[PDB]
Amino acid sequence: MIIPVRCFTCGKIVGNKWEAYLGLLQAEYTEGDALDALGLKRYCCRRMLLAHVDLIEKLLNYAPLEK
Amino acid sequence: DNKKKIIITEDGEFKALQEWILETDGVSLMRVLSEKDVDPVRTTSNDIVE
Amino acid sequence: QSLETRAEIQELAMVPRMIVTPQSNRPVMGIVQDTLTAVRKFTKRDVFLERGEVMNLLMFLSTWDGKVPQPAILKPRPLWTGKQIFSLIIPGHINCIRTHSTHPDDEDSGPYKHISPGDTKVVVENGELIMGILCKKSLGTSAGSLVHISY
Amino acid sequence: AGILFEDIFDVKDIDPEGKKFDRVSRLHCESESFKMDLILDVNIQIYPVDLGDKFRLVIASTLYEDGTLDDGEYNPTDDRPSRADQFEYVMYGKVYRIEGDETSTEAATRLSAYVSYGGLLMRLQGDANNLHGFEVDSRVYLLMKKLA
Amino acid sequence: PYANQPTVRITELTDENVKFIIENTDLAVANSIRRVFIAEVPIIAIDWVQIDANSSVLHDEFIAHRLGLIPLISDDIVDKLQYSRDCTCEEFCPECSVEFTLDVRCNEDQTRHVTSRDLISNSPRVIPVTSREQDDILIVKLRKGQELRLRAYAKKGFGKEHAKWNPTAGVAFEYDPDNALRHTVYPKPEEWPKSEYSELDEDESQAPYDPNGKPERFYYNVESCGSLRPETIVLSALSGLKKKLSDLQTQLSHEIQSD
Amino acid sequence: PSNKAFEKKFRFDYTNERALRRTLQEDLVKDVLSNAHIQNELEREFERMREDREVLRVIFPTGDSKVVLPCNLLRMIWNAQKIFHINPRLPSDLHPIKVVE
Amino acid sequence: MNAPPAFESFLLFEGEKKITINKDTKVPNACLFTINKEDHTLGNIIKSQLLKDPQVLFAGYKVPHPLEHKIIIRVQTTPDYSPQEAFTNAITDLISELSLLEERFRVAIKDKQEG
């Protein structure tokens, strides 16, 4: 759906790293490089960004029920 | 030991003897028991009706 | 739903009253899953408990008289043993003899019969664990186990 | 007082057939005076011992020279002269077996006392005249002391 | 029979985390301090949410949940606040809560990112963690024509109630880096990598056993979520535990003197 | 057990002075040796034991003695030893005729 | 629908008492302390401080059930020393120990900043 606000295990704020992570992946940083470029050292926090899937974009593709 | 023949010696022991036994595939308990040299006391058949 | 049937269930079908089954004159309940494994590791010969760890474990005994036993080792520092505490768990004055799962067969024939190098003959005497390692064969549902004799 | 046994032993061997436990080991030791055998299980972590070492045993029914039959209860606070103050390694167990060389007619010549300290076993095997005060289901202290 | 004197020295101080060492104290005291860090330091987070309109693609409880997890900079206000259960005021007042508002509507054809910057607070000091290049916490994405309006209130609470009141991100805790007390037993000590705080040569795998040792030199690394400063988390935790023990002391003294 | 071993284990052999004096008090060894009524009763008890042995062998052609019975006699004996502090090193006090009667 | 409220773990209802004292009848100079709405955070530090007292024969703590929120502390003392004063002495030493630690910590943090 959308990026979680906090890491489930650690509790570190990970909700503001998604847009930066995507931007770095555009620039040929690899994931192993982009993740620690953002300051995510514990693998519990790293798996959040690494395994997240963003379905909010597919939902926004549909027309709203209102206007 | 329960299929092996068990006797009692002169010193009151229970030595397990080993003797030949024959298992069959049919059942005709009467014509078998009434035969020479077959042991008529222990010969069982697994068929209750017979 | 009624007082008569309530009393009858209490006096006939309570769990503690159903420990031994008449099907095979063995106990039905037994120590199982991670207590059994933790008991075998806890009652081994080389298990020593400091004073604080013993005082915590005794805090979980319901049938304890409030008397701390004399430690098996006094002077270099006071150390208890797993057997020394499991003896406090055993109730009354129970006496039974069991063999561990890994007990070699030749051990009984030769010397060291009553002083087992492998700690593999369970001997409980006067309600106190003297020697041996408790396994499924000692606390399980087999006939003659420590719970069967206790019942 | 009360001293069930007193002698100086020498470690003739450490656990044969390998060690089965990493903290405790079995040692076989002999005697100089009484010429009797001991098999003792000891924890090496707090009291390490090596082959060929020489030590003194004092098996006693109590830790007091007064010979007052103590509680079997653990009391840390006691301002009494303890027999263990002069000793390094002190255990506490109960004798659970006494085997003999006796027969139907003649008495026992060689005795073997088995005593367990919380699961640590000891077999003391000598002549009947030395293992005299050992009685089954009795509480004893092994007081050991290593000496040069 | 008396208290021992412990000592502290800080090896790293940052706006993000404090790393320090405590000497000459019990294991239990160290563990309890580690425990109070996570559970029993008061902090401010939004707990009451009233939604006036929500045309987004996430349902009302999904947005209220995400809102709850947004950290708020509460450094000195949290001390002078009161628990909502303790305030004698009938309705929300400035002395027991902080009010937030959010009115965002997407009109242009570009996707609108509703982030924490859109939360308008009532107090100039209690604001989201993006106070002072980095982006901000993303709440929701809105398509053209969608909107959401909501009014929220922040209260004081600690971790024991809910994890949103947890001030710390990660509390690393260690003692006895080289296995001297041997509270843990390695079947093969060679395979185990050295700790950061270990002091051994490349050859030696673990320290020699000493039977007389006790756990000392506890190593802490307290990393903040951004709501409280890393250094003030520890001061608040120590004060809270001392106050907790003091309340128990008063209640026991009252009970004994009445007994 | 063997015919030689069965007899060795369950006869009351009352013709040995020292052997009997090893296990029994002094007030009882003289009674066993002197009184012939007691000796006759003991011989009769062994004859009953021999008869029971013959009956068991005909009941159980299978060698195994493992059986299922109401209350564990060996465990009760062990319990009695530990309750009364028997100390099986001194001569016994129980009169052998009290056992039979 | 059966989930208890979150604040159930630390809030006392009306009529409940924080700490209750019951004398132990099995052995002399023994006592049991029941603390409501507490967990290991408080029981463990109290027990460890008590074990330092030379005049305390026994000290232990337990939580009867994790779903319940109660602690039980058993204190046995040598006969010249009440368990109640042993408990209060442990508390008043732990408080002093924590206050000293906080003061040293704040001094160290001040010295870390340009010191």
Add this chain to the structure above:
Amino acid sequence: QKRITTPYMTKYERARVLGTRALQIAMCAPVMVELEGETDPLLIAMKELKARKIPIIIRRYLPDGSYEDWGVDELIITD
């Protein structure tokens, strides 16, 4: 007049007697023992059983059709 039944209370008889006496105590029947402040009829019934004061007799029906009447006090309580 002659009694060939066991002199012990079977478990079933013990269960039914306790239940059916606790029911009478529930209905304001007089109590046979000096109870000590307890309020539960089952505890009171268990006390009257152990004190051997239950005013109930048991009619054991033999297979032939005859029957024997045993007072609660006349037979040994198994527990």
